[PDB]
Design an enzyme around this catalytic site. Sequence first.
Site, mmCIF file in Angstrom:
data_model
loop_
_atom_site.group_PDB
_atom_site.id
_atom_site.type_symbol
_atom_site.label_atom_id
_atom_site.label_comp_id
_atom_site.label_asym_id
_atom_site.label_seq_id
_atom_site.Cartn_x
_atom_site.Cartn_y
_atom_site.Cartn_z
ATOM 1 C CE1 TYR A 68 20.602 -42.934 -6.421
ATOM 2 C CE2 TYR A 68 20.860 -45.300 -6.154
ATOM 3 C CZ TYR A 68 21.419 -44.043 -6.319
ATOM 4 O OH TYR A 68 22.797 -43.879 -6.400
ATOM 5 C CB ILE A 92 22.754 -41.057 4.719
ATOM 6 C CG1 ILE A 92 22.080 -41.336 3.407
ATOM 7 C CG2 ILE A 92 24.050 -40.355 4.479
ATOM 8 C CD1 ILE A 92 21.368 -40.159 2.872
ATOM 9 C CE1 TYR A 110 26.558 -38.646 2.341
ATOM 10 C CE2 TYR A 110 24.764 -37.793 1.026
ATOM 11 C CZ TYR A 110 25.597 -38.828 1.385
ATOM 12 O OH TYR A 110 25.452 -40.042 0.777
ATOM 13 C CG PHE A 114 16.876 -40.221 -2.440
ATOM 14 C CD1 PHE A 114 17.323 -39.468 -1.370
ATOM 15 C CD2 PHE A 114 17.789 -40.742 -3.307
ATOM 16 C CE1 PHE A 114 18.667 -39.221 -1.189
ATOM 17 C CE2 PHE A 114 19.128 -40.494 -3.126
ATOM 18 C CZ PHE A 114 19.559 -39.728 -2.072
#
Lengths: 213, 213
Positions: free
Chosen positions: A132, A160, A186, A202
């Site tokens: 990633y 997450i 977050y 991402f």
Amino acid sequence: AFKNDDQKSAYALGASLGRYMENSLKEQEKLGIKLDKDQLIAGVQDAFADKSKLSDQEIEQTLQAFEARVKSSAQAKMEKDAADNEAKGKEYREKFAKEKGVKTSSTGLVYQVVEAGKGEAPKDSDTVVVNYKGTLIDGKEFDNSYTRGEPLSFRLDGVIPGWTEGLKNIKKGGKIKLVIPPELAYGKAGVPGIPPNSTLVFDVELLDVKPAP
Amino acid sequence: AFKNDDQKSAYALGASLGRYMENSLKEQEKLGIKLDKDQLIAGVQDAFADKSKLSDQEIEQTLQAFEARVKSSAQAKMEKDAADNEAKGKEYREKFAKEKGVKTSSTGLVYQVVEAGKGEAPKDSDTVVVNYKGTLIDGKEFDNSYTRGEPLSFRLDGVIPGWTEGLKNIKKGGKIKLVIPPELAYGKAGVPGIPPNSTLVFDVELLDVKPAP
Ligand SMILES: [Cs+]
Ligand SMILES: [Cs+]
């Protein structure tokens, strides 16, 4: 322009203190505090000359109060930046959602499957192996699997939600782009390295899927 | 004369640094170092304005060198003060030796028995109990038995020689004034509280004498 050690050392001493201050100010500025620079020097001069307009007790209670004002100003900055980051983020998520192959989940995850994958899809208790690259919406990277010199492997329910949700949209061998709103990431608080309320982007490649041992 | 917190805090900050410097200088002055004060402020100003005449590396190597210069200047002061203290001391010892009832031992101890005492005289292995008052030749006291709220008891061979020699010149119940040259005391080095090469003046009363258990 020093004729002797007495002069050079004195100057060096001042210089190091002057730099110390300059750098502290820059620190304060990042917490949203901008101190009057002439006053700062005027305090140094006055006190050095035994003519400070503040008593030693005052100086001390003011610094204590300044500490409080810093903690407090940081808090206010955090919240301001949080609002700006989500404003930017919402706009980015909204543009990206309009692109080809992009879907927005009921949770607000915006995703784009780039390669479907041919294995199976991970589930919550599964360990995944992934390549990633992650960045903030300004395009600056905070993580690269790639550059770390290796891919990462972790149980999927630990990370997450935006991610756990996202990787379930593809199968082993798949590739997916995830654009994750802060609440799936977050939060407004954020974490060391990630600013408050930031939307994360991402590119992910799912290399493998393994069951919990 | 602050119209807001930005100004007051800045000034307080400077003031505290200005006092910090002022106090460091006074510390340096006691080691025989007197820094040019205008240069010190000029360094603070220049660096703060991003115009220091010294590079950051220079500033750092100069401060390191200043540290060495402080340790070294202290050494030189110690020796200077040592010479002055013995000059004063020698003169004091020489005046006192000319007074009534005063004797100078071959070792250089100058002493005056004030009350002979009726017991016996301590010997090296004996524990003595004493009242005393000690000062430097400028008359300033460093020890008072009296004020300590109590007298002291110690084995006699442990203390400085000037003393052990001196207390052997009287007997239990006796009183003696001792003027001890540095070499019979703390030397040119001295100890915390006693300056280098100092002649010590004691009034002593010997309350008791006991054998080593
Ligand atoms: Cs779309
Ligand atoms: Cs005499």
